[PDB]
Design a protein around this ligand. Structure first.
Ligand SMILES: [Zn+2]
Ligand SMILES: [Zn+2]
Length: 46
Protein backbone atom coordinates (compact mmCIF):
# COMPACT_ATOMS: atom_id res chain seq x y z
CA UNK A 1 0.00 0.00 0.00
CA UNK A 2 3.10 2.19 0.21
CA UNK A 3 3.63 4.91 -2.39
CA UNK A 4 6.53 4.57 -4.82
CA UNK A 5 8.61 7.75 -4.97
CA UNK A 6 8.98 9.44 -8.35
CA UNK A 7 12.75 9.10 -7.99
CA UNK A 8 13.68 5.49 -7.21
CA UNK A 9 10.20 4.25 -6.33
CA UNK A 10 10.79 3.95 -2.58
CA UNK A 11 8.34 2.82 0.13
CA UNK A 12 6.67 6.12 1.04
CA UNK A 13 4.02 6.23 3.76
CA UNK A 14 0.85 6.70 1.72
CA UNK A 15 -1.96 8.53 3.53
CA UNK A 16 -5.31 8.33 1.73
CA UNK A 17 -6.55 10.77 4.37
CA UNK A 18 -4.98 13.70 2.53
CA UNK A 19 -3.70 11.79 -0.49
CA UNK A 20 -0.10 12.48 0.52
CA UNK A 21 3.08 10.38 0.53
CA UNK A 22 6.27 10.61 2.57
CA UNK A 23 9.39 8.90 1.21
CA UNK A 24 10.96 6.69 3.88
CA UNK A 25 14.44 7.20 2.44
CA UNK A 26 17.28 9.02 4.21
CA UNK A 27 18.14 10.49 0.82
CA UNK A 28 14.70 11.98 0.23
CA UNK A 29 12.29 12.14 3.15
CA UNK A 30 9.98 14.74 1.62
CA UNK A 31 6.23 15.33 1.59
CA UNK A 32 4.26 15.30 -1.66
CA UNK A 33 0.76 14.69 -3.00
CA UNK A 34 0.14 11.16 -4.29
CA UNK A 35 -2.40 12.62 -6.71
CA UNK A 36 -0.08 14.75 -8.84
CA UNK A 37 3.14 13.36 -7.37
CA UNK A 38 4.17 16.99 -6.89
CA UNK A 39 4.85 19.36 -3.99
CA UNK A 40 2.33 18.96 -1.17
CA UNK A 41 0.16 21.87 -0.03
CA UNK A 42 2.17 23.52 2.75
CA UNK A 43 2.55 26.89 4.47
CA UNK A 44 4.45 27.96 1.36
CA UNK A 45 2.47 26.64 -1.61
CA UNK A 46 1.72 23.65 -3.83
ZN1 LIG B 1 13.28 8.42 -3.22
ZN1 LIG C 1 -1.38 18.65 -4.88
Amino acid sequence: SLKACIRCNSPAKYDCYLQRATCKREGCGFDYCTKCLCNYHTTKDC
